[PDB]
Ligand binder design. Sequence first.
Ligand SMILES: Nc1ncnc2c1ncn2[C@@H]1O[C@H](COP(=O)(O)OP(=O)(O)O)[C@@H](O)[C@H]1O
Ligand SMILES: Nc1ncnc2c1ncn2[C@@H]1O[C@H](COP(=O)(O)OP(=O)(O)O)[C@@H](O)[C@H]1O
Ligand SMILES: Nc1ncnc2c1ncn2[C@@H]1O[C@H](COP(=O)(O)OP(=O)(O)O)[C@@H](O)[C@H]1O
Ligand SMILES: Nc1ncnc2c1ncn2[C@@H]1O[C@H](COP(=O)(O)OP(=O)(O)O)[C@@H](O)[C@H]1O
Ligand SMILES: [Mg+2]
Ligand SMILES: [Mg+2]
Ligand SMILES: [Mg+2]
Ligand SMILES: [Mg+2]
Lengths: 447, 430, 443, 442, 97, 49
Amino acid sequence: LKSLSLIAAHSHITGLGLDENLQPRPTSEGMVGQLQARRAAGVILKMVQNGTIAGRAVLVAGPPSTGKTALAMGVSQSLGKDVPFTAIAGSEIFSLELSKTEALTQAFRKSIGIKIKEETELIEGEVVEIQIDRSITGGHKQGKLTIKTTDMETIYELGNKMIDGLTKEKVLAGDVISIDKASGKITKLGRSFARSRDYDAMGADTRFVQCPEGELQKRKTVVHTVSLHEIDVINSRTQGFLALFTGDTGEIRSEVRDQINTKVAEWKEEGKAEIVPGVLFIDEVHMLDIECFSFINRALEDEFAPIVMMATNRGVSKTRGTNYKSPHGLPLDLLDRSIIITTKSYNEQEIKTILSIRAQEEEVELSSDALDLLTKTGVETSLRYSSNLISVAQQIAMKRKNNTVEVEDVKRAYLLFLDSARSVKYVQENESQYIDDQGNVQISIAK
Amino acid sequence: KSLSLIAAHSHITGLGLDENLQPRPTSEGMVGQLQARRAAGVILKMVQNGTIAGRAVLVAGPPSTGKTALAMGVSQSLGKDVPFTAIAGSEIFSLELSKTEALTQAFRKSIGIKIKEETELIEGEVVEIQIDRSITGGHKQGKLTIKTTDMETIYELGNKMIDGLTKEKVLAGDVISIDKASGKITKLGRSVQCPEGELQKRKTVVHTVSLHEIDVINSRTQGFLALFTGDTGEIRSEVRDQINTKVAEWKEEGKAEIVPGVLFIDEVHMLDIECFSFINRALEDEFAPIVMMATNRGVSKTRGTNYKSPHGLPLDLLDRSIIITTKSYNEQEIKTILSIRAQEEEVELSSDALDLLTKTGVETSLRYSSNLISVAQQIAMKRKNNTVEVEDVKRAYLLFLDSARSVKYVQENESQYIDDQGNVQISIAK
Amino acid sequence: VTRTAAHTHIKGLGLDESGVAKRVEGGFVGQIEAREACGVIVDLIKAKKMSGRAILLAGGPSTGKTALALAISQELGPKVPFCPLVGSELYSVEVKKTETLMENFRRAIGLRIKETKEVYEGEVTELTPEDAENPLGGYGKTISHVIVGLKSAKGTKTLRLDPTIYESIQREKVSIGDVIYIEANTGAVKRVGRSDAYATEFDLETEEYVPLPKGEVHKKKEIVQDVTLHDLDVANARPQGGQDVISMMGQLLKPKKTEITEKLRQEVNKVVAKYIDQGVAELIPGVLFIDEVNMLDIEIFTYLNKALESNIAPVVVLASNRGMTTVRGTEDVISPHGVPPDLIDRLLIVRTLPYDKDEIRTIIERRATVERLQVESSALDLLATMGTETSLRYALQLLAPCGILAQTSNRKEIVVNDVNEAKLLFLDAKRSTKILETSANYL
Amino acid sequence: TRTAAHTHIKGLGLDESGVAKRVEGGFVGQIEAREACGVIVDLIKAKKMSGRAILLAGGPSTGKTALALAISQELGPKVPFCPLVGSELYSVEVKKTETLMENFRRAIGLRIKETKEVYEGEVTELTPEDAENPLGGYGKTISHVIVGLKSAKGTKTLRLDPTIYESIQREKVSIGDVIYIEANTGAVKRVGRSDAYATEFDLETEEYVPLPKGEVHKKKEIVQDVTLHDLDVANARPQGGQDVISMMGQLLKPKKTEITEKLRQEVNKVVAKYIDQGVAELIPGVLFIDEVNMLDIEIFTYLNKALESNIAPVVVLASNRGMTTVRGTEDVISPHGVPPDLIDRLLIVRTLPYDKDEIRTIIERRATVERLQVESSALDLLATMGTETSLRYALQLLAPCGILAQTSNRKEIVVNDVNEAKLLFLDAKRSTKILETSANYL
Amino acid sequence: VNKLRCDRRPIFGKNLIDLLTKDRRVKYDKSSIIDNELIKPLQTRVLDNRKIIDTFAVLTPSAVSLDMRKLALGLNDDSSVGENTRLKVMQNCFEVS
Amino acid sequence: KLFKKNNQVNRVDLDFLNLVFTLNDKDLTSYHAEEISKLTCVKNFVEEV
Ligand SMILES: Nc1ncnc2c1ncn2[C@@H]1O[C@H](COP(=O)(O)OP(=O)(O)O)[C@@H](O)[C@H]1O
Ligand SMILES: Nc1ncnc2c1ncn2[C@@H]1O[C@H](COP(=O)(O)OP(=O)(O)O)[C@@H](O)[C@H]1O
Ligand SMILES: Nc1ncnc2c1ncn2[C@@H]1O[C@H](COP(=O)(O)OP(=O)(O)O)[C@@H](O)[C@H]1O
Ligand SMILES: Nc1ncnc2c1ncn2[C@@H]1O[C@H](COP(=O)(O)OP(=O)(O)O)[C@@H](O)[C@H]1O
Ligand SMILES: [Mg+2]
Ligand SMILES: [Mg+2]
Ligand SMILES: [Mg+2]
Ligand SMILES: [Mg+2]
């Protein structure tokens, strides 16, 4: 609801359909079927929620449109907020600004999070009157100011250094300010409501807030969630927070990372900061350079390694960067340390539920005979195809203005938009018209 | 002005034409090439008309035959005040700029815009200028006397005007031009010039600015420096999308006009396939220059692909372009061309030497003999005679070898020269 | 007067309310199927419900693909953002191609922003500071308020201002008789110039003069300006604020593209997601268009799979000509249209048919009417046969030069002798290859 | 308590001047390998030899890396050890050669120890001592300044030369504030006000530290260690807040620059000057490059001249591959991927695969660190599976069997649980066998 | 003014200023050491090398264009920069050494 | 100046709606932002109205 409401490839999947016994339901939580793969994913889910293990990889295998992308995405939804998750692509780690090794190191750094808690002691209250004597005697005559709160009012003596500090950020009283207890820092919240009617046009600094309620000074703790990557970028630069948003990291030296690791170790020893194990998901890893594979092989064994899951639909094929063909498209070293989860193609019965459950998402009413033709065309074609026809047939039926999508509108929608298998035939017969790999093309129809 | 010593095209000026577009046999440094001059003239009048934009035309022909001289005569016949851009195919390749943006930058450079502004200027000799320090009565009081031949009057300065006269030291008796709307002073000389007339006159100032020059200024704090320094660095496309609309509104209001300049690309055969793919989209848009492309090679391999396309260009680009073919020169034209170069280089050639130079021009090449005509003048200069002689042409023929002769010499001397395999023999015996 | 480059005669798809395409409408001839196919696309773009959906229209060369891709943009209207893109433009030296692709993806969508501002403007009559005799202990010297009178044509009003916004006026060096612009929201003061009536005071003056502003004094206005999300991202990356000497050199340095983090994009989606909830802003989708998609590397093709699954992914349309060929960046892979099969699985395929000769004859007619020239019918038939024997785009190119020869012959209408003369000066590709094969050096 | 594929390795597990034990430090078998590495530990502790490299070769899952982690443990936390991968040598910022030379100098550390006498405590009072000046004058002349110091359990009075008044004036200390005074170097430092003075003002911006514990006069020593590379970076990098060069540091971006040899030699000069006086101690470290097979021949070439350097440390290499074509040269074939000229400069340590009985002990020892306990029956299956499928497969199946055991509420793994975990997670061989039977492109 | 205050006030730091100084400040003490003699920052080496710079600096940029320095930074009598901003920058450059 | 033609007519300040927020970490803290947002004076103007 906080995210933008525009519908995505899979918007229906929310969480995983596993119970406390992990036994999957046939249709639940937005997904359908894939029982064994969903259970094998839930073992990883409790594996992350436990947090006692680190440095392991898992693989999700299957042909195209088998549900591998809707699987890892379902894991991130059931995992919930406050647990850091990083979803990237293998082709994205190729960059001119960063080396692939460091660009992958950042991909491993962003997944693991850190929660830091800090307590503060502040004195916040509205000011009544401020008196500072100057020429009566001299030399910090010990002026006194009166701070007002709704339920309490007291008078505070002001020291010489506080006299010098109050001059900066000048206060006329009639104002609400807050003074730090430890460092004596003066902060001005803003003017009261009685000062609003003085000017018709006022500056951009002015503002009005209610008088603080309760005790004058309070003890409050604040919690922050910051990933290790943000810590490293902040420590790497004089101003690193701007480097976060501008996106230029600068290839942080690996020397600082060890210092940050010692810092996190000391913070864990003191108990001020606890770490939350994160998840890293790389989609379409069938295209990756071998240096990245070896660096993944080494970088997975460190003390903080986020759990890594990946999906590749390539069969036995040549790896990028080498002439030889390794199975699955990955080197045997990466397959040695890993666990492979296989997904199987859907049956006819499941496809119609995947369709109707999609029409519920698009809010498109369908006739009982529309799912028959859309399912029949869905079997010969791919499940990912007819899902677009369910969208177009809604507009074609909208032109006819009547309610649910009729079968004839589905036939017209299938007639206007060609299947991937038909375009191959139309190209093969018309080959002389289309451009060729050799560059030969016949523009003229006349012979 | 514009110091230039000698150029290959230095002779031909403005192609040549008649009101019937029929080319003359020899017109303004252009001999030969009848049909090519007529087609190039049709393209020229098409540019001068400006009704059609974004059209490509191709100039094809053998090396050293009627190709670059065509586009040179079209650029010179087009004259000043209209944009003409000539870039080599290897020039668009850049390490700092992408090939696509560097290719669009020329399309933006080839189209200009004229902007007019009216100003009221007061100019004349200053005989007397008095300036007074601040007093309680007024901030500053001063009176300058601007004397002109027709009228002489005195003006009382405007405060900050006095700061402009005291800002830059001004001596009485020099001719200056003060800009009321601009607020700056322009000194035209001393009294070097004479006062023409009335002090204040309303004039209009026309400024010819290309689309690129408008585009660079808006993308930067100071973009005019980015024009000269070439650091422009891939201006956003959104800025250009705003420039086009703002220019459209300027045209509807009548405050500006556009000039459909010409874009000429030498050595198009060496352009990458990506650039060829971008040109197809760049031609179909609203603002595009008329493009002329010339390639010497034909039936070769396109750079970036394995297959060989005809003429060395993709057929998709050949569809958008119109092809003009040039023919090899006959024997009677070569002597007239070499005579034109003789008149251009201040070289006196006898008819007997012109016959041998023509025969060598037909047997080998025109570019060669036209190089020799320059070298023989010094050999004739050592003999102190003003006119070149046959013996000097023969001496210049034996001293400097031709290409065909040098190849036949290399084939016999191949053992001495280095080989593709790297084998060489520097030892004389054994 | 008017410029026409291979276009501008297409005013849209020209579809009826029932969705049926006329035989000829809007400069479009034939291709009823492809027209009806794109109209439903326009309807889906207007529906706003679907995001990331993509439809590919593939056909032979000069079949009207691109010409139709401009027609859909004409059908959407100026309010709907349309970003043209070519596969060869995605490669950039400054940043990786991926960030450029995702960048254009966000450049397609757009958002409208409305906010109300109230401004006091007019000529300054009399401005006076007001100093408080009370020291208050906070400051040595200050002012309680500053009263500045404002004069306008409809009326005059006196204002009471705080010392800060008066300090801004002192920075603007405003004097009595100069028009100023004071906005209530940001509290910024701008001096437009000196009033027009005071111009006659001095003979020579540096300052410009402007008339007194119309309106009483105070004005209430709202600004409905619409801005794309990517422009919010670029404006978010480079701040325009601050007087620091560092910020000045930061403005001097040329803008250099950089890879934007996903966190900043997520924050922008958060604040926009709040503004759309308050109703102050309204998000609208937009269309991305890519030409010559076959020139894309397999890396960009792979990133397109993850990019289309995003919720903010705009509708993108692809157009390709070539048949089954080796995909760029792949060694042995052969796929139709030059697109990987995994991406073809996501798209929708639309096919474009060639044109009959009788249709070409009408194409030359309409191109001549938009060209405003005059063509005889007897020469029109020959131009049709010529266009059918070589190519359709060659006759549309032949219409241009004949107009010049007709002016030299003074004839108002094109004659068969004129085009027959134009054929000898200009050759097409087929003749150029034939003459290219037999010659001494590369013809 | 986080464990990733490790942490059951404690040191090498050797004994005193003898053959390595059968099982120590989580190590089983391969006594010859960790013994030969045991000698290398002594070679490194000798701190004499330089640029001596060794390479341990063997098949995958043979324990190549665990030996490098083991010697890294055996050297101790004070000895610098840099984990590095051959893929990390390629960087867009600088050439590979400069990165390799930088990592070569990251290995050697340098320790600095300093002893300084301090005087700390509160201020009881400050009084001048007037004496006659050497040359007669009317004005005042102070011979010494008396400063009292109060700390917990003690009190003291000091006498300083009159030049201390400038430093005391700089630090602005008067009375009742704890100060910091160094014996020979002198001057002062003001840490903060005394704690008993917080009550006199209800609101104050200055913090109050308590009086120093123990005697007012103390002598302590502090040891600080810094690597030579971290030292060089500070020399090459400008440091200032407001400086114009530092002003160009902001608004621009820092990028790794190739460091000249002159600067490195200049740092070596001062490091040698401090090591001669006894204040500095140079301890060579160990560089470790995993997957050396990924290195280009240009780096292999620079290692030849680099290993012959005088300050070059000991670098351990690991290459699992057999005869391969070296990267950068298609025709050349050399064992392990290392060129023969580079092989000539190192010592090879072979590794052998683990026996079945050793595998079962590997899993049973991994169970303790995993904190999961298994029966004897289900362990015998993990042994056979480990030998057939692969070693890292049985070690990978441990956690899913425990999670499934928690779903069944049982606290120990059962045969049914290891079979159910077998069906859910497949190894490499099963997947590669499934790819052949499917035409779906799977 | 009500909507003005309702807009202006909700300005939230995406992280914090206290998170920047929290993850920066080091727990370790100063530990004054001789390492100050082992650093010798680049700025001091310009001062210690004064003799070599004095003797070995010879060549001059024979061709220059005056008033290209003011125009490069954009600060001059007429530009798009503010009137007072160029003055404040001129004073800042007049101060910093 | 030709591109300085009237803008703020159709221009949004865009800095008043806090879409520039990446500049807020320099001078502004977290707890002051939370308390500052919680203490707002709204509902008093409604009473005075
Ligand atoms: N469990 C599921 N239930 C319903 N639909 C699913 C499920 N898993 C996948 N899908 C469908 O599969 C499509 C996405 O397939 P994807 O995982 O991207 O395949 P691949 O990753 O092989 O490209 C979505 O349109 C979605 O409707
Ligand atoms: N029609 C012509 N009239 C006069 N000189 C010509 C003509 N055509 C070519 N030339 C001569 O050819 C030389 C350059 O040849 P060019 O046209 O550049 O060949 P290409 O363009 O094929 O390289 C010029 O020095 C010019 O004098
Ligand atoms: N149906 C049509 N009606 C009118 N003109 C057309 C039609 N189809 C194509 N054209 C014309 O053909 C020209 C080039 O076609 P284009 O769409 O660019 O081909 P491609 O899609 O292969 O790039 C365009 O200028 C367009 O005006
Ligand atoms: N002596 C041993 N005892 C127990 N486990 C071992 C032993 N040696 C290696 N291992 C196991 O081998 C794994 C490390 O293998 P590694 O050396 O990385 O393989 P490779 O030789 O391919 O690099 C560790 O997880 C560890 O559990
Ligand atoms: Mg996927
Ligand atoms: Mg040429
Ligand atoms: Mg096209
Ligand atoms: Mg290893």
